[PDB]
Design a protein around this ligand. Structure first.
Ligand SMILES: O[C@@H]1[C@@H](O)[C@H](O)OC[C@H]1O
Ligand SMILES: O[C@@H]1[C@@H](O)[C@H](O)OC[C@H]1O
Ligand SMILES: [Ca+2]
Ligand SMILES: [Ca+2]
Ligand SMILES: [Ca+2]
Ligand SMILES: [Ca+2]
Ligand SMILES: [Zn+2]
Length: 316
């Protein structure tokens, strides 16, 4: 909508207070004009028709319980936009400042979030398995990164290319969590997952096997569930990414860590320059080695650590 840009205040899913960019035109709308062609947050009103209604508020204060998922969806979309612009010089998910749209209050008791090809969608959770999923910055950045992938490598969402697709979203979801310095870790979804159980998460990049996901190519899932295990076999790539950044010894192979920033540069270059819709794990290794070579040289420690990490998880 057309109107005057301003700043509102509210509280997010976890009770933290934050400022949010809004637009004033009779109502205050969750429309952020400061980032590209805009960030728009919609109310799905417990239905499944999308996008719903552009979020309208009478007084520019968002402290109601019903407001919390919208505040966080809106705010964390902005942080993720900032990450890609400031760190990778990318303007929104299409590289041309496409508008970012999110809908919250999707369905009833819906324990998931997703990119549907055009926008982000967030359930409120059932209060037991999940609380509203926009409360996790790594979740929001995970979903928005699916849009980046769709507009770049276009990895098909099945089998090995789909597991790469999932891992990319976990990797950059985590790097955004570190970028915002919001209690960062190498776990996925810990802030919104099982509010009754402390210390757990949906997936672990540092130790995928903690939750039964494979940490080595020999342990990959080969069945048909989960589109061929796109959320399961991502653990193999997640572990490799963790080893590249932090280092360690895994199945007897030692990796020297090179840090989060170089991990991000290497995988972003592989995603945007070398990966294709049908890339498999072996081709991801080649893309990451080539990207490390482009950036740091064929004889660099960086190239060495990429090779070691994929050796450690058994990807040749
Ligand atoms: O309080 C909530 C209200 O803000 C929303 O608009 O509709 C559902 C209610 O529970
Ligand atoms: O009002 C929402 C409620 O419907 C849901 O159950 O928990 C999250 C709240 O935002
Ligand atoms: Ca209000
Ligand atoms: Ca965290
Ligand atoms: Ca996390
Ligand atoms: Ca928990
Ligand atoms: Zn995903």
């Amino acid at each position: 909508i057309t109107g005057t840009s301003t700043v509102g205040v509210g509280r997010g899913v976890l009770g933290d207070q934050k400022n949010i960019n809004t637009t004033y035109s009779t109502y205050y709308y969750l429309q952020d004009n400061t980032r590209g062609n805009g960030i728009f947050t919609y109310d799905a009103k417990y239905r499944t028709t999308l996008p719903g209604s552009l979020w309208a508020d009478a007084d520019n204060q968002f402290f109601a319980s019903y407001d919390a998922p919208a505040v966080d969806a809106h705010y964390y979309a902005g942080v993720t936009y900032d990450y890609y612009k400031n760190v990778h010089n990318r303007l929104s998910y299409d590289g041309n400042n496409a508008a970012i749209r999110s809908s919250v209050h999707y369905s009833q008791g819906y324990n998931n979030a997703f990119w549907n090809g055009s926008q982000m969608v967030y359930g409120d959770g059932d209060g037991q398995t999940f609380i509203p999923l926009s409360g996790g910055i790594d979740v929001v950045a995970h979903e928005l990164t699916h849009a980046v992938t769709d507009y770049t490598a276009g990895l098909i969402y099945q089998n090995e290319s789909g597991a790469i697709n999932e891992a990319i979203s976990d990797i950059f979801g985590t790097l955004v969590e570190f970028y915002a310095n919001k209690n960062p870790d190498w776990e996925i979804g810990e802030d919104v997952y099982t509010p009754g159980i402390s210390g757990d998460s949906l997936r672990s990049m540092s130790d995928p096997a903690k939750y039964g996901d494979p940490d080595h190519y020999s342990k990959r899932y080969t069945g048909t569930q989960d589109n061929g295990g796109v959320h399961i076999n991502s653990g193999i790539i997640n572990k490799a990414a963790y080893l590249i950044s932090q280092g360690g010894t895994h199945y007897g192979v030692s990796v020297v860590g090179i840090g989060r920033d170089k991990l991000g540069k290497i995988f972003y270059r592989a995603l945007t320059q070398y990966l294709t819709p049908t890339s498999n794990f072996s081709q991801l290794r080649a893309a990451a080695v080539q990207s490390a070579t482009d950036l740091y040289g064929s004889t660099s420690q960086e190239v060495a650590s990429v090779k070691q990490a994929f050796d450690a998880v058994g990807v040749k």
